[PDB]
Design a protein around this nucleic acid. Sequence first.
RNA 1: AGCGGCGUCGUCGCGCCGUCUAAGCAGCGAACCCCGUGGAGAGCCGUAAUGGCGAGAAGCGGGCGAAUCUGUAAUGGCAC
Length: 92
Amino acid sequence: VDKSLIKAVKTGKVIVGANRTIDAAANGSAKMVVLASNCPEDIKKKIQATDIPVLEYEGTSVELGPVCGKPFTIAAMAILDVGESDILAATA
RNA sequence: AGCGGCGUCGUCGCGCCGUCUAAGCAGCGAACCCCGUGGAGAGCCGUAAUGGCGAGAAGCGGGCGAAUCUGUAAUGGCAC
């Protein structure tokens, strides 16, 4: 769940941000969508409406950010293609 | 700067006054704010200053939106 994200950011297709994740989920190219625990409830409506598997993240977005490689905060992130990673195995 | 008066004038050519125009009506809209795109971090964008940013910056479009300004009212008043 944690080390897989390192390879998901190293290799494969990923997009950071709520809106681009919405677009990827509606398009369906995003195989899985990863969300932080304390995200606003306004985002969960799409993540349930979208058929994409909903991988929870136990932490908050504040520490989700730095582990993903970005100093800022990450609310909802999608990985379009895993490539050299197995975070999808964590999700499905 | 030009035009019309008044003053001074031992010498010079300066000094002062005037050269106006209401509400109403019609048009335009600076900031803030709202929306559609946009995809920015070993960092970028700004302010007199505080600052803003994947919970979406810069940039690009659209919308709501001031005083005041432009025309008319424009023929009234002036040593017409």
